[PDB]
């Protein structure tokens, strides 16, 4: 749609919305992120502060597969179970048998602590765990089985 743009409403009006005194000239201000510490300094120091400098040290050859630790909290743990069975694990589990949850197959590498859970024993298999998130599981009745 060009019939909806303001280039159409400016047919007739010389100085098509870019002015008469100061016009639409050809790159005034430099090309780019230029003048970042000369004449655009008090934008780059207001709206983008932290530009202009080195921090921290270099990691040559980062593979972002080592640093695969997706988090899960104790709220979605019962979403990992399929909706059809967590019904009969919630109201049940007054029995001895306990549902087992493989977070690594869910796609997660760590479990965390945010939130609460029912007093329902689980078994939680994960390669990394937080202290509070083990404390809550043991408190419910469960256990944590580190893997890998």
């Amino acid at each position: 749609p060009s019939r909806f743009t303001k280039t159409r409403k400016h047919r007739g009006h010389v100085s098509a919305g870019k002015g008469r005194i100061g016009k639409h000239r050809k790159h005034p201000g430099g090309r780019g992120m230029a003048g970042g510490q000369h004449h655009h300094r008090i934008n780059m120091d207001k709206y983008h502060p932290g530009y202009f400098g080195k921090v921290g040290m270099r990691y040559f050859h980062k593979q972002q597969a080592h640093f695969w630790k997706p988090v899960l909290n104790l709220d979605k743990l019962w979403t990992l179970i399929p909706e059809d069975k967590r019904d009969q694990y919630l109201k049940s589990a007054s029995k001895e048998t306990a549902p087992v949850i493989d977070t690594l197959a869910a796609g997660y590498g760590k479990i965390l602590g945010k939130g609460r859970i029912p007093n329902v024993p689980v078994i939680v298999k994960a390669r990394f765990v937080s202290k509070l998130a083990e404390e809550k599981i043991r408190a419910a009745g469960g256990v944590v089985e580190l893997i890998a």
Binding site: V100, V143, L146
Partner: protein, 37 residues
């Protein structure tokens, strides 16, 4: 497959977080401690 869906619980006396927190440390301090001997 992996283990059986819906099996039993063996809450033994260990702490997983502490286990990891220690396995990290012994891996860190193996080489300095074997130099200690």
């Amino acid at each position: 497959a992996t283990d059986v869906e819906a099996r039993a619980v063996q809450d033994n006396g260990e702490s997983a977080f502490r286990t990891l927190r220690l396995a990290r440390s012994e891996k860190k301090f193996r080489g300095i401690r074997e130099k200690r001997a």
